[PDB]
RNA sequence: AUUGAAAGUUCUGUUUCGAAGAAAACCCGCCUCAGAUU
DNA sequence: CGGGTTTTCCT
């Protein structure tokens, strides 16, 4: 598994939208529970959903897969991740629906040999014999850091006009500025492995041949998420992003680093990693840290400089 | 016995679901009675059921048991905890049904020598001669703390879309933020001990040999629950969790610590533990405390740092 | 005598159940008559029966009696309180049935020297010469407080599923939250004393020797009820309990404190206790109060902190 | 002080044991607060 | 302006 926590600083941003009222376009907001010296309070803060990040990741994965020669589905070749949900998609791609429970494994292998996206990002088919496949990359909402007593975020509305020589043309757009945080998880030990229980079916040899390439592509795809190629309204509201802190852990057992809420979340996660490897009888535990804000790190930890170095190191091992 | 009270802080969460209405996925809610300065009131608040936690605990126990060589049932090798309820499971596993009341102990031992899950988590078989085994781990609903006059919890709905080039695609998801509390109990003095009354039956020597490993594995399995690996919808709604306060008590007599609703529940439970050991003629009483919010603790109390240290200490003693 | 009134606050609870309909398990409910400013009304409210409390008390008594060396019956050693009702129990234990009326005292003493449970909780034998022994501890149904115009209680239904890989598994459970109240009475002056009139029978000397230990054990057994170890479905629906108010009175004459329905029920019972001792020519009247909700108490009343102190004080006197 | 006067249908018992609403999905594609003044 | 929840279980 590869687990990570990342902290970003974003200014003058509008990357996720919600239903509009009047001539105003609104930014997504959510309630958060925060702890101050006086107790616990409830606040409303701008957020960014995780499905936009999932879409960006899967689009980059499609690009890399088509570049490197891996198979890509017909519908997903165009950036429409309906996958194989409805029967219309099955008809377009040309895959017979499963007949019974015993036939499920064949259908899963057939779908899994045509589109890498269905293999990595999971899918669901509903019918007489529904077939499920959980995603191999897990994301979450992007929240500003709940540090201290004051939330380091702000939201406002802005005024815009459309010029016309014959007036008979005014709209408002919400803009936010915050210090976002988020964490991610990716289990590369289950890529290119069937999930439905059953007997062996012809075609798994090709999967075993392509396993290494699929894992390499899946690990490569994370560069988009770690770089900042996500969100909408990028044509006229291009944001100003800057990485601040990053922790990545590679292990052989389940593990979850601390959220990027406290100023000291790198020392704690490394100590916890050592103790967890000791207690769970693991055999591999490595840590990589990127720091640009000069906070406490610890001892005996590899320190990197950019994200390309981290991607290369993750690929090599 | 091992009895514990734990306090968590969760933000932007959807971990337990219930039946859906329209295009809206709903979060579990329950009524709670709360005391304010003006009297008593009834409120509707999001909660998380205990059966999700039980499933997470049993899945982790399956993983550890397979890793350490302890026997695991065939159906329970797959993460499907029907245990030995119906006749189909008995036919699959290959165990003869009990004949009379006198044969109940043999059936319990045979079931108990094949699946550790049936041993630790209890089971039921209904028929001509019913057989019961109560669970050795007990859990409860996860509730936000009912401190003060305002409940520190909030629930809202969010708007999501599925993109398509040929419109002919909209759903809503309920998201919560709360300060959750829950308590648990695990009696390790009865693990690998038959429950049905009767005579001695061949095969108990193997259970006596495996008792130590079974107890060790059961104690290890709590790390998943104390870490935060439970609940659904984790692929796109990965939650942000953080521990705040934990009290764990090891005794030789029945005891129940205070619920984590009042800010002073560590001092009270320690005083009660001392007096209860005095009054019930016990011979062992230990307490461990993890504090990360700076609330009153007391004197002469072991203070830990993480949960791995607690797990190691519980294993060693 | 020892007479008490106790107020509890329970949330997300399912402790007593009744017949099931379909896939729904129901909670016991009863009608109550309540007085409001508009007159008198009838309502349906969840309750907890008294026999569950009696079972919990007797189980704790069995545990303590076995620990302290007092005799315990063969059938009651396993938690099955058939006592000595039917002839099969007599045959299993090995006690001859009474012959005539004059032999009743012999049978009562013989049964009373073998099981402390029969002595404290009473018993009944039906036959040619019926034998009765009234219980020495008296309990009642657990009702929520009937204060004001609104009953502080709520009941709802919850949805649960069982997972399976081959659909062919859905149930509902009723869950309640309320402010319960209950009162109890225990006359320790009749413990280890035969009740059937007759002549002296050999074996009463042993009862006189064991009277002190039997009284001590009977008083100690109240800790379970005052702590909260009762009810079913504790494996997955562990409740969140918290004491709020308790009044316990020790007297030499019959007396009954006020029910815990009004906010002022501690001052009233103390005034009534003083006047009743004045009028009935008593010689002992002590009161103990546990207060955690800041209601009116009075003057010249012993104030405790926990329940263990109360149990110790009851034992010492 | 009345077809009245005298009468406990009373004692003893858990509705218990076990079971993830779970898997898949961008609200997004275009728009100037602009012209005149010590 | 187009688009507004899909199955498989109900002791």
């Amino acid at each position: 598994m590869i687990s990570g926590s990342v902290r970003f600083l974003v200014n003058l941003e509008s990357l996720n939208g919600v239903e509009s009222i009047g001539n105003l376009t609104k930014h997504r907001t959510a309630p958060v529970v925060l702890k101050t010296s006086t107790g616990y309070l409830v606040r409303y803060v701008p957020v960014i959903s995780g499905e936009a990040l999932a879409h960006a990741y899967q689009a980059s994965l499609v690009d890399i897969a088509k570049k490197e020669g891996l198979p890509v589905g017909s519908l997903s070749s165009q950036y429409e991740f309906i996958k194989f949900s409805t029967d219309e998609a099955l008809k377009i791609e040309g895959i017979k629906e499963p007949k019974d429970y015993n036939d499920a494994r064949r259908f899963e292998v057939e779908v899994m040999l045509k589109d890498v996206i269905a293999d990595v990002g999971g899918f669901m088919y509903a019918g007489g014999a529904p077939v499920r496949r959980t995603s191999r990359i897990k994301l979450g909402y992007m929240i500003p850091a709940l540090r201290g007593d004051e939330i380091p975020a702000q939201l406002e509305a802005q005024f815009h006009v459309r010029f016309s020589n014959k007036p008979v043309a005014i709209f408002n757009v919400e803009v936010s500025s915050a210090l976002y945080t988020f964490s991610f998880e990716l289990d590369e030990d289950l890529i290119a492995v069937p999930s439905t229980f059953g007997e062996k079916v012809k075609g798994e040899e090709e999967l075993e041949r392509q396993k290494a390439k699929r894992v390499k592509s899946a690990i490569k795809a994370l560069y988009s998420l770690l770089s900042g190629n996500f969100g909408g309204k990028r044509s006229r509201f291009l944001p100003s992003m800057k990485l601040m802190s990053l922790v990545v852990t590679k292990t052989d057992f389940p593990f979850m680093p601390e959220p990027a809420h406290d100023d000291d979340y790198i020392k704690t996660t490394i100590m916890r990693l050592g103790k967890a490897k000791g207690v769970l009888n693991g055999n591999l535990a490595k840590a990589y840290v990127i720091n640009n804000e000069g906070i406490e790190v610890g001892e005996g930890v590899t320190v990197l400089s950019t994200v390309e170095d981290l991607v290369v190191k993750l690929e090599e091992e």
Side-chain angles (χ1 to χ4, degrees), chain A residues 1-266:
Chain A
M1 263 168 41
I2 296 173
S3 288
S5 303
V6 176
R7 178 181 276 182
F8 272 118
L9 178 75
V10 176
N11 299 317
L12 266 60
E13 169 267 324
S14 178
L15 292 167
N16 205 328
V18 65
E19 268 180 351
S20 312
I21 307 175
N23 55 350
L24 173 64
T25 62
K26 304 190 80 174
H27 200 292
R28 180 156 276 159
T29 47
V32 299
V33 170
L34 197 149
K35 181 177 186 294
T36 60
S37 72
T38 55
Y40 294 88
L41 298 166
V42 185
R43 290 275 164 75
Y44 279 78
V45 190
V47 301
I48 288 163
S49 79
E51 286 180 346
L53 315 177
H55 183 92
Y57 177 92
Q58 276 161 85
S60 285
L61 175 53
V62 175
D63 269 308
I64 279 164
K66 269 171 71 178
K67 180 165 171 174
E68 275 208 12
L70 286 160
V72 178
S74 161
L75 265 174
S76 83
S77 285
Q78 313 148 23
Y79 304 96
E80 177 187 331
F81 306 119
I82 197 177
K83 303 203 200 180
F84 299 77
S85 167
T86 77
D87 184 54
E88 300 293 329
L90 263 53
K91 186 170 178 178
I92 279 155
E93 303 269 15
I95 303 179
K96 295 285 183 185
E97 58 190 354
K99 304 177 177 70
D100 318 297
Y101 302 99
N102 286 263
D103 200 72
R105 181 135 185 169
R106 195 268 311 153
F107 174 78
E108 163 157 16
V109 177
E110 205 166 18
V111 171
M112 184 177 176
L113 268 162
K114 191 180 281 188
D115 203 21
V116 184
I117 307 308
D119 176 26
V120 165
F123 65 91
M124 182 207 93
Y125 173 68
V131 167
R132 297 155 205 158
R133 175 148 168 106
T134 307
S135 171
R136 312 260 165 274
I137 170 166
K138 300 186 179 184
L139 294 174
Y141 267 61
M142 197 178 278
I143 309 150
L146 309 177
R147 184 178 28 82
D149 288 9
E150 314 185 356
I151 311 179
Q154 196 69 82
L155 182 76
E156 199 180 0
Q158 306 282 2
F159 190 78
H160 294 293
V161 188
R162 170 166 60 177
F163 176 56
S164 196
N165 308 266
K166 296 207 181 196
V168 165
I170 287 162
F171 58 107
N172 282 311
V173 164
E174 277 189 20
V175 164
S176 177
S177 284
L179 167 76
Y180 285 116
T181 67
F182 85 109
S183 54
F184 75 95
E185 164 174 320
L186 182 63
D187 62 357
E188 83 288 345
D189 287 315
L190 290 163
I191 286 165
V193 164
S195 195
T196 312
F197 288 86
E199 297 178 353
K200 275 175 187 177
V201 165
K202 177 59 63 140
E204 278 156 17
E205 298 183 351
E206 196 67 26
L207 278 170
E208 284 175 355
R209 273 173 228 153
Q210 304 180 347
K211 188 177 294 202
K213 266 183 194 175
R214 296 208 184 195
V215 170
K216 202 163 141 62
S217 284
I219 290 163
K220 248 180 201 188
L222 284 172
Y223 178 61
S224 76
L225 267 185
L226 293 180
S227 193
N229 299 285
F230 52 85
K233 274 180 193 203
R234 293 174 72 85
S235 65
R236 305 280 172 264
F237 298 96
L238 195 81
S240 175
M241 285 204 179
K242 162 164 165 55
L243 192 78
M244 304 294 274
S245 287
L246 177 139
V247 189
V248 176
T249 316
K250 182 156 174 176
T251 65
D252 292 6
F253 49 90
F255 187 74
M256 280 187 300
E258 305 276 4
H261 289 171
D262 284 318
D263 274 328
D264 305 0
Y265 75 109
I266 299 148

